[PDB]
């Protein structure tokens, strides 16, 4: 009955985004410069996350180190040795008293920073997943949503240490997830060239979006929570609307033949920042599908990319062992 | 220049000193990725010289091998983690001719991957005692040695080396070794071949290549 779904999606398609936004003033050529270069990690950066306080960020590297930086002063607040050097995700708690990570160990390890006269130690270890841990995001100090390479996502209880609900209907390894601003839903993009919208309370899939052509690598919710973007291996970013249940934009240009590693939006949502495997990053007009800027400062591969909560800066880590703050 | 700020810079300085101390020992050790099929018997080589982590030291140089097997059979995504390894170890069941095609295609996909094109591969044809007693591919009729067990072992090695030399030039190399079931010298092999690999990178950065 997928033909009926395609017909229903076609029936509601009456104004393309390229047509309804053809009389909108284009933004200027976005020229951003590096402000800080973070130079303390030994090997390639794999992930990064921003603190809610918009000053502190955590990062992960191939050398099995978890460094918490002070972006204003470039000073390392923490340097946490991990039991496994193979990690791919970082999570900063909204309260700021916890940090999580994970990877090929298939375990989300949680580290308590605000200890009593003691260094940072592993507070908990969540060990119910089967495939490699791809992404994790704190809901609060006691709940964390995790995705892995066993084609499943799970919501955990940190105090008890076992899963509360599991989001099992998916094909291919789930590569990224993005929490809604209301924290009641989340979208996950996997390696089956599809993305799904999940309900945290109900534990069921409500929508599926199958516009892309290859493995989806990054996913980011729109600031109002009514849309999201997906960066995939087909060298194309696309924009999907939850209400319309169809793709709206396709941020694809010729001479781009590399996959998108990271995807993030600005505070207003006008700019879509996408990291690429062609050593550099791109700035996209979200409602015009035209290039607006390039962050060409990295040397090996832009693996992670995040925009600050207040939107004052964008931090992009890279495979050259350096993080960069842009403005 | 406040007291709290000065304490923050002092703590960052101590952290950076510890980071330099860790960098001293991180570059002095070598990471090895262990790959192969289920019947390859790679764990036999692991236990002889000892996600499973195996640490051993040869000539006071520390090697650390990783046998990741807690995953699914779709490895196009998590194999990018083993990008800065000194070498990839491939273990092949040379005595089970049914699966040599899949092993050859696996080595071919490892060879031509964009994220593994600069990483050298050490090859171990493991089950050689079973191959000798035992003795599909139609090239064995016209193949000539560069008894028949020598022809078979060097023919499989030549198939692997043909795939290796078909596309990999000047960035990474293949090292075929003929492993046995009760070999006690694969640590020396891994040491010498990692030594050759680092010598090749040295010659590249010394502008001599």
């Amino acid at each position, epitope marked *: 009955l*997928k033909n009926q779904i395609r017909d229903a999606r076609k029936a509601c398609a009456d104004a393309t985004l390229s047509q309804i936004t053809n009389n909108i003033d284009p933004v200027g050529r976005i020229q951003m410069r590096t402000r800080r270069t973070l130079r303390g990690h030994l090997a390639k950066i794999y992930a990064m996350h921003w603190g809610t306080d918009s000053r502190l960020l955590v990062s992960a590297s191939q050398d099995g180190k978890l460094i918490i930086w002070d972006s204003y002063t470039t000073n390392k607040v923490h340097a946490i040795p991990l039991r496994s050097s193979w990690v791919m995700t970082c999570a900063y708690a909204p309260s700021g008293n916890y940090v999580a990570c994970g990877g090929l160990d298939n375990i989300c390890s949680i580290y308590n920073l605000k200890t009593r006269e003691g260094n940072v130690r592993v507070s908990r270890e969540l060990a119910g997943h089967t495939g490699y841990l791809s992404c994790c995001r704190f809901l609060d100090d006691n709940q964390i949503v995790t995705s892995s390479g066993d084609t499943t996502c799970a919501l955990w209880d940190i105090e008890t240490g076992q899963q509360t609900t599991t989001f099992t209907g998916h094909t291919g390894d789930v590569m990224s997830l993005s929490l809604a601003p209301d924290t009641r839903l989340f979208v996950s993009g996997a390696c*089956d060239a599809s993305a799904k919208l999940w309900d945290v309370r109900e534990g069921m899939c409500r929508q599926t979006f199958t516009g892309h*052509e*290859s*493995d989806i690598n990054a996913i980011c919710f729109f600031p109002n929570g009514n849309a999201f973007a997906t960066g995939s*291996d087909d060298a194309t970013c696309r924009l999907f609307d939850l209400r319309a249940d169809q793709e709206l934009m396709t941020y694809s240009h010729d001479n781009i033949i590399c*996959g998108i590693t990271s995807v993030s939006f600005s505070k207003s949502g006008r700019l879509l920042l996408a990291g690429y495997d062609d050593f550099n990053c791109n700035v996209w007009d979200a409602l015009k599908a035209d290039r607006a800027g390039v962050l060409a400062g990295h040397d090996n591969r832009v693996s992670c990319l995040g925009v600050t909560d207040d939107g004052m800066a964008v931090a992009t880590g890279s495979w050259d062992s350096f993080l960069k703050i842009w403005n | 220049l406040s007291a709290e700020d000065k304490a923050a810079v002092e703590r960052s300085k101590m952290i950076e000193k510890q980071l330099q101390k860790d960098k001293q020992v991180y570059r002095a050790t070598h990471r090895l990725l262990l790959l192969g099929a289920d019947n390859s018997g790679k764990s036999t080589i692991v236990k002889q010289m000892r996600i499973f982590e195996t640490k051993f030291q040869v000539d006071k140089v520390n090697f650390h091998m990783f046998d990741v097997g807690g995953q699914r059979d779709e*490895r196009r995504k998590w194999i990018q983690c083993f990008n800065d390894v000194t070498a990839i170890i491939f273990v092949v069941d040379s005595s089970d001719y049914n699966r040599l095609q899949e092993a050859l295609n696996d080595f071919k996909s490892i060879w*031509n991957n964009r994220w593994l094109r600069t990483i050298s591969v050490i090859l171990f044809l493991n089950k050689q005692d079973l191959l000798a007693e035992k003795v599909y591919f139609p090239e064995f009729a016209r193949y000539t040695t560069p008894p028949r067990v020598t022809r078979a072992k060097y023919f499989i090695r030549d198939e692997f080396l043909r795939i290796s030399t078909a596309s990999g030039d000047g960035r990474h190399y293949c090292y075929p070794h003929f492993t046995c079931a009760v070999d006690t010298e694969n640590a020396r092999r891994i040491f010498n071949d990692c030594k050759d690999i680092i010598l090749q990178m040295n010659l590249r950065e010394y502008n001599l290549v």
Partner: nanobody
Amino acid sequence: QVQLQESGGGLVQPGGSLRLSCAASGFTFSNYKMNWVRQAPGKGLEWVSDISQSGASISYTGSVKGRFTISRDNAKNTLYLQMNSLKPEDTAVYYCARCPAPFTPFCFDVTSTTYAYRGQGTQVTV
């Protein structure tokens, strides 16, 4: 939605000949490397053929060379496996497979137990 649909699966004597054609849809045909994936009663997932995006590089399994010549049509979005020298040891289910990424001949995960960009398959019985 990446959809691949095959055809041309019917009972054939040890002699004779047959042809398989997979009709690709939902993606750009000419940017990807494609292959042929074989099954059998009570064994795993095999690998028969291979062709590049341009069509200038062809690889075969050691037991299919000279008998299972292939073709592709970037204009018609089709890929073929012309079967001419059949044997009774060829009863299989044939899936038209695809490399995970464009400009990428990795096809790292083509013959996996679960693969997203693989067709449903046609039973070729003998």
